[PDB]
């Protein structure tokens, strides 16, 4: 009796909230997420749960690390919200099952108690130094790589203020040339065609100790971008 949230609309994923959330952003893909969860399966047999866990469980969503039926639903849930799903073996683990605790061809519930998400860390050494919150997946899968032409739409705020609006076209690697910071760069890197992102910088994957004076931009500031890769061509290596 709960509201179906497949794609396809195939019942597949059946959820009603027991508890609404607070505020109105849900979890993208990319965006680490952390929950509280108990399975059963459709008869009531319990195989499952993180209640004991000394910590959530946490994922990075929409990257298939866990079934199906899980990266669907929590795109649909706010913080603070905890729902039950009940899960088609076709959004879970299908005719194969999962030994011991999950038969082949397995309706599954579960309950879902969303705590918390944050955006993606890009960065290579995973010190927060770069975080995306994606707006609106691209669809391509390829991305540009060192040397790559790409054609950008970007908007630069420093404390919210607008300090760069550009539509340009440029070499991945060039990009301080055309006042662009390195990070920006490593984060176009990241993203897909036609993928609209949010994309946080902090100051050493910013312009540093240096800042940006014709842009108003200071020694050692965090800069936000909200960025739209629309299309490139990738050079040869």
Not at 70 to 83: F, H, L, R, S
Not at 91 to 98: L, M, P, Q, T, W
Not at 112 to 139: A, C, H, M, N, S
Not at 196 to 219: C, D, M, N, R, T
Request: aromatic share 10%; with cysteine.
């Amino acid at each position: 009796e709960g509201v179906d949230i497949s794609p396809k609309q195939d019942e597949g994923v059946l959820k009603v909230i027991k508890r609404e959330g607070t505020g109105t952003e849900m979890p993208m893909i990319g965006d680490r997420v952390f929950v509280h969860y108990t399975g059963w399966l459709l008869d009531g047999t319990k195989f499952d749960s993180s209640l004991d866990r000394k910590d959530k469980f946490s994922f990075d969503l929409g990257k298939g690390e866990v079934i199906k039926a899980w990266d669907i639903a929590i795109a649909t849930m706010k913080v603070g919200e905890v729902c039950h799903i009940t899960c088609k073996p076709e959004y879970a683990y299908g005719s194969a099952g999962s030994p011991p605790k999950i038969p082949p061809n397995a309706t599954l519930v579960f309950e879902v108690e969303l705590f918390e998400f944050k955006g993606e860390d890009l960065t290579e050494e995973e010190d927060g130094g770069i975080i995306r919150r994606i707006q609106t997946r691209g669809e391509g899968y390829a991305k540009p790589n060192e040397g790559a032409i790409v054609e950008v739409a970007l908007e630069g705020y420093y404390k919210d203020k607008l300090f760069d609006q550009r539509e340009l076209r440029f070499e991945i690697g060039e990009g301080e040339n055309l006042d662009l910071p390195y990070g920006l760069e490593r984060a176009i890197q990241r993203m897909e065609k036609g993928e609209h992102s949010i994309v946080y910088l902090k100051p050493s994957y910013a312009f540093g100790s240096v800042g940006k004076e014709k842009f108003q931009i200071p020694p050692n500031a965090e800069l936000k971008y909200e960025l739209h890769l629309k299309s490139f061509e990738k050079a040869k290596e």
